[PDB]
Design an enzyme around this catalytic site. Sequence first.
Site, PDB file in Angstrom:
ATOM      1  N   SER A  67       0.672  -1.007   0.078  1.00  0.00           N
ATOM      2  CA  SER A  67      -0.025  -0.159  -0.099  1.00  0.00           C
ATOM      3  C   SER A  67       0.739   1.320  -0.078  1.00  0.00           C
ATOM      4  CB  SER A  67      -0.912  -0.076   1.128  1.00  0.00           C
ATOM      5  OG  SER A  67      -2.215  -0.653   0.884  1.00  0.00           O
ATOM      6  N   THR A 311       2.403   2.811   5.725  1.00  0.00           N
ATOM      7  CA  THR A 311       2.728   1.531   5.936  1.00  0.00           C
ATOM      8  C   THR A 311       2.340   0.861   4.518  1.00  0.00           C
ATOM      9  OG1 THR A 311       0.656   0.669   7.123  1.00  0.00           O
ATOM     10  CG2 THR A 311       2.805   1.282   8.351  1.00  0.00           C
TER      11      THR A 311
HETATM   12  C1  LIG Z   1      -1.902  -3.720  -0.467  1.00  0.00           C
HETATM   13  C2  LIG Z   1      -3.249  -3.502   0.239  1.00  0.00           C
HETATM   14  O1  LIG Z   1      -4.162  -4.788   0.282  1.00  0.00           O
HETATM   15  C3  LIG Z   1      -2.937  -3.484   1.942  1.00  0.00           C
HETATM   16  C4  LIG Z   1      -1.782  -2.744   2.539  1.00  0.00           C
HETATM   17  O2  LIG Z   1      -0.546  -2.571   2.374  1.00  0.00           O
HETATM   18  C5  LIG Z   1      -4.295  -2.993   2.628  1.00  0.00           C
HETATM   19  N1  LIG Z   1      -4.609  -1.532   2.111  1.00  0.00           N
HETATM   20  C6  LIG Z   1      -4.063  -0.776   3.227  1.00  0.00           C
HETATM   21  C7  LIG Z   1      -3.899   0.721   3.027  1.00  0.00           C
HETATM   22  O3  LIG Z   1      -2.960   1.418   3.520  1.00  0.00           O
HETATM   23  O4  LIG Z   1      -4.728   1.453   2.526  1.00  0.00           O
HETATM   24  C8  LIG Z   1      -3.822  -1.444   4.373  1.00  0.00           C
HETATM   25  S1  LIG Z   1      -4.411  -0.537   6.037  1.00  0.00           S
HETATM   26  C9  LIG Z   1      -3.291   0.010   6.938  1.00  0.00           C
HETATM   27  C10 LIG Z   1      -4.180   1.081   8.153  1.00  0.00           C
HETATM   28  N2  LIG Z   1      -3.332   2.403   8.450  1.00  0.00           N
HETATM   29  C11 LIG Z   1      -1.921   1.859   7.439  1.00  0.00           C
HETATM   30  C12 LIG Z   1      -1.039   3.098   7.605  1.00  0.00           C
HETATM   31  O5  LIG Z   1      -0.781   3.964   6.402  1.00  0.00           O
HETATM   32  N3  LIG Z   1      -0.230   3.192   8.746  1.00  0.00           N
HETATM   33  C13 LIG Z   1      -0.445   2.230   9.650  1.00  0.00           C
HETATM   34  C14 LIG Z   1       0.732   4.372   8.485  1.00  0.00           C
HETATM   35  C15 LIG Z   1      -2.541   1.136   6.437  1.00  0.00           C
HETATM   36  C16 LIG Z   1      -4.099  -2.747   3.963  1.00  0.00           C
HETATM   37  C17 LIG Z   1      -3.248  -4.007   4.923  1.00  0.00           C
END
Ligand SMILES: C[C@@H](O)[C@@H](C=O)[C@@H]1NC(C(=O)O)=C(S[C@@H]2CN[C@H](C(=O)N(C)C)C2)[C@@H]1C
Length: 359
Positions: A67, A311
């Site tokens: 993500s 993340t």
């Molecule tokens: C490839 C995708 O399927 C996944 C991420 O890598 C999912 N998508 C998101 C997303 O970031 O939008 C998170 S949720 C997470 C909730 N808050 C995080 C963030 O940005 N942090 C903790 C800084 C992101 C899924 C696993």
Amino acid sequence: HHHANIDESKIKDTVDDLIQPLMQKNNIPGMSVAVTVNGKNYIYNYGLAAKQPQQPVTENTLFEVGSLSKTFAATLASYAQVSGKLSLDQSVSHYVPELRGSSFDHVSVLNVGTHTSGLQLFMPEDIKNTTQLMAYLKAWKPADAAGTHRVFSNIGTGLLGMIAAKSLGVSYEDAIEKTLLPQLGMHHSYLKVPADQMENYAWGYNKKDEPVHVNMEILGNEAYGIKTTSSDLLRYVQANMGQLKLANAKMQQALTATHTGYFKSGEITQDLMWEQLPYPVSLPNLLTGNSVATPIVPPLPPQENVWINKTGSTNGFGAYIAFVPAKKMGIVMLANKNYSIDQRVTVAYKILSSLEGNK
Ligand SMILES: C[C@@H](O)[C@@H](C=O)[C@@H]1NC(C(=O)O)=C(S[C@@H]2CN[C@H](C(=O)N(C)C)C2)[C@@H]1C
């Protein structure tokens, strides 16, 4: 060789002391950690990109960033906006005419850029082509109105990137690989890894320690398509802090504008895909930050005194970026195993905190 009083050795000692235990305790085969501070860059590589045959992590190792890919879709939308091709306040159906008359009459581009449309996280597995995707979207309704709640969404990010690219007259893949990444100087960053770089593409290791690479499905490029090096992501961090000549004047404005604060959820400020907290941050709120969405209107302008972060994960990889513009410092941590976010943020906090005295 280690040298007392030399920047790269002092930083390496701090990074080694945290990353080596982190990799052992999580059985992470390989990592790269990149740090920028005072306009200087430091890259540290650990362990193995692949186990059998063994291949070490090098300066050229490519990792999936999951993500983190969403921030590139946001940067593209921002570039389209500052170029006068896209208005974030306009509706999705304004730009996607097949959705006119659907729920997307009431969803803004900003909503899909801030996880506030209400679209669910995962694309349904049976959606294989654009016709099926459009039929799904035309028939979709959320339980709550767009703009009321934050729900992280791969589908929403997909629409954000698709709309941004179309407003520039190109496919998303073209926009990213032919316009955005080249203008950022990120020459080792890809949505599809070319043949001469496959030897550098680390294997990911899933929860069962099986070697895996992410499978790209519809609208996947926008949400999870990027494979890149820590060095390229550190350039991206520096560009987000205005440190590079760069791109365009428009590209710098685009990067900076993604830091605009649009919604508050709990203690977290939702920017355009990026998330931020006021700096200095205490580790508890960082961990607490990992829902009702309250608009910030007028939006909070891009700030210096904030911790900006994102993340990203895939089945085999775990990535993290954090940077503090007021301190011109940032960190990229890439791993070929998906380990818990609390550990990513804690290690990053400890490393960045180490880079200047307390005052
Ligand atoms: C490839 C995708 O399927 C996944 C991420 O890598 C999912 N998508 C998101 C997303 O970031 O939008 C998170 S949720 C997470 C909730 N808050 C995080 C963030 O940005 N942090 C903790 C800084 C992101 C899924 C696993």
